[PDB]
Structure formats: C-alpha cells, structure tokens
Amino acid sequence: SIMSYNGGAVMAMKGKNCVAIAADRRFGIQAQMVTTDFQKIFPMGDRLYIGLAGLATDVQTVAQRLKFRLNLYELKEGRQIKPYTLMSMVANLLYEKRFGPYYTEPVIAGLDPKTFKPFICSLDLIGCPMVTDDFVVSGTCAEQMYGMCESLWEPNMDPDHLFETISQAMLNAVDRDAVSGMGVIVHIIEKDKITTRTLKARMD
C-alpha cells in the first residue's frame, strides 16, 4: 500500500502527571533501509510534542506547514498554544486537502500549560480527532501495538514505571514488524524536566 512504502510507528501513553511518546528510527524504501536516524517526533513548544507516521514526504511536509502556522499564532497572540487547540489546528490543515490528502497520521502528546494535565489524541489522514485517556498508536504495525497496551497499561503510573511500560510495548511490537525497527527513541515529558532516551533494540 501507500502507508507501507516507508513504514513507521508512533505510540503515546498517558501517565499520572506525565506523558510519554515513542517512535522508531528506520528510514527506508520498501525493502531497503537508508538511514537509522530519521526524525519523526517534532517539538511544538515546551511540554508539547507531535509524532508523525506514514509517507516520508508528508512527514517532512506537514511538520513544516504546521510550524509555519504555529509561529504566526504565538506571535499574533501573546501566549503558548494549548494542547487541545493544536488538535483543531492540525485537523483544519489536513481537511483542506480533502481530495489531495497527505498520507500521514499524527499523534499529539503534551501537558496543559496552566494546570499541568496530560493530553493525548490521534488523527486519521483527513482529520478525525480522537481523544483517549490511556494510549494512542499510529503506523503500519498498529495491531501489534494494541496487544501490548491493552495488557500492560495501568491507570496511575509514576514516570519510572511509565517508561518501562512504553519501552516494553515498543520493543516487542516493532520486533514483530518487518518494515519498522532499527532503533527506538523515547521522550517522556513532565512539568519539571524532560527526558529523551534511546533504547537498545534489534538492528536485525
């Protein structure tokens, strides 16, 4: 298919007063890797990230049109954007190409800036937003990632056990996929600091 042309996997998971996001590192064309440091998670202000998965053009294209509209928002207004507001901004951006659609599926994760409350959502390729309270996934290996998160997620998790759950959810689901792998990067954010770790995965 078109989504399986480059592969990819993005997972977000909600914790107690924190939220983690993870993605793979492989860039490739249908059978053949090219590099293992392809960026798929982009910062949108402090304590608010976005992950993109799908066609590798629209990963780099939408992440630049969205940054274009975001800086004009935060200069016309005097404040940073709420996590709920960005979801309506992306859903506008994808729906304008209703018949010329971008082949990507965004995943948004971040904390609310005033009251530090987590927020996760995901969108299809024409912008149907879906907010949840436990986890959202996007990419080619979606069904493998549902078997992980339905069996491993707990309601109230400190950032230590939140890291261990989203790591074991990614290292086993991506290992079962063929066109996704070659490393996993994990961002875990919270109101005081922010933490980026890279996992020891199979380069197989």
């Binding site: 069904e143 493998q144 549902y146 078997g147 992980m148 339905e150 069996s151 074991q168 290292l171 086993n172 689901a173 290992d175 079962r176």
Partner: protein
C-alpha cells in the same frame, strides 16, 4: 460472480509445556457484518494425546476435519497402533499440498504430547509447510497475541529477568488474560473461551465467558 471463498474469522492459540499442551479458541462463527452463532468451538479431539485447531473458511474446516478422522482409522487398521503427534503433522502436510492449485483456506495448529510426555506444537500454513514451536497463535487476532507471548513466555527484550519454565498454573491465567485483551480490539473474537488441556492422563476442558459485542 460466484466467489468460492469467504472469511469466517476465529482465533486459536496453543502453548507447549514441559508435560502438557494447552489449546484454546473462541466460539464465534460469523461472516460479513453478521453473527451466525455464539457457540462453535475449534477444539477438535483427534486422539487422547492430540488436539487440532482449525481457523479460516469454515466450509473447509468441516471437510478437512472429517478427512483426517478417516485416515487415523486407516492407520490403525493397517498398523495396529494409533498415530503419534509427529506422524499426524507429517501426514497433514501432504494432505494440504494435495490441493496445491486449489488450496484450503485453513490455518492449522496441532498441539499434543510426544512419545516422552513433552509438549509439541506444530503450526501450518494453508499450503502445508510446518515447524515445531513452543507457542503459536493463528487466525484473525494472531497479530495481537504473538507479541505478548514473546514477552512472557519467550522472555524476550528483557534485562536481568530470571528464566523459570512455565508452570501449568501460570499458563492458565496467561491464556485467560490474553483473550480478554484480544476481545476488546478485534471484532471477530467471540464470547466463550474453550480451553482444552492435554496432559498425560487425558483431556480437560474449560469454558470462560467474554464480552459479547
């Protein structure tokens, strides 16, 4: 026009143990968007030491089961003993290949005991290739069940974790939990969970309810 195939869903699961073999499956038969019945298991007892699971097109699963049960009788009338578990798997590989150019749309997993009282799991493709494994999951939700058992049974992707073999008690609650996660996200996984346990003394059965969407 007339298409000869349809997908009826279903999900089977087998785990080989040290002195046991557990085979489980759902009990929902359904094609399209409708429901035919809420009671149609896939646990088929071949001998007292071998249970087969059959998922896929249900018209082929009915036929293939009756072909096998005839040939177990033809072996005994010609050799004065029952088939072993490894002999069944070598036989059924030839049966599936015999219709190479009009294949069965059936996924097969054979669980049972060997000659030494150890577990054995043989998983098949619809053409008839196989190997012996410790655990396999076949059917519609096979993409959801296989990553979970790599973590728990295979002890994969973990650090500083001791390697204890799976007991019978741990393997029961491991099976019961993994279908509850599969029934949430799969539309095909059904309502009752028929679990068949093959030991050195016979075959026990157990039925566990699920949600009924």
């Amino acid at each position: 026009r007339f298409s000869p195939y349809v997908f009826n869903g279903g999900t089977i699961l087998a785990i080989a143990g040290e002195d046991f073999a557990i085979v489980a499956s759902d009990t929902r038969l359904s094609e399209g968007f409708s429901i035919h019945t809420r009671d149609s298991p896939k646990c088929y007892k071949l001998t007292d030491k071998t249970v087969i699971g059959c998922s896929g097109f249900h018209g082929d699963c009915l036929t293939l089961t009756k072909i096998i049960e005839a040939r177990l009788k033809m072996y005994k009338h010609s050799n004065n003993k029952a088939m072993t578990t490894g002999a069944i798997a070598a036989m059924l590989s030839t049966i599936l290949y015999s219709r190479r150019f009009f294949p069965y749309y059936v996924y097969n997993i054979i669980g049972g005991l060997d000659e030494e009282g150890k577990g054995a799991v043989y998983s098949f493709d619809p053409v008839g290739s196989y190997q012996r494994d410790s655990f396999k999951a076949g059917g519609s939700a096979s993409a959801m069940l296989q990553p979970l058992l790599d973590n728990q049974v295979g002890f994969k992707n973990m650090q500083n974790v001791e390697h204890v073999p799976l007991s019978l008690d741990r393997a029961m609650r491991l099976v019961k939990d993994v279908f509850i996660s599969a029934a949430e996200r799969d539309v095909y996984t059904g309502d009752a969970l028929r679990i068949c346990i093959v030991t050195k003394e016979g075959i026990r059965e157990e039925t566990v309810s699920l949600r009924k969407d």
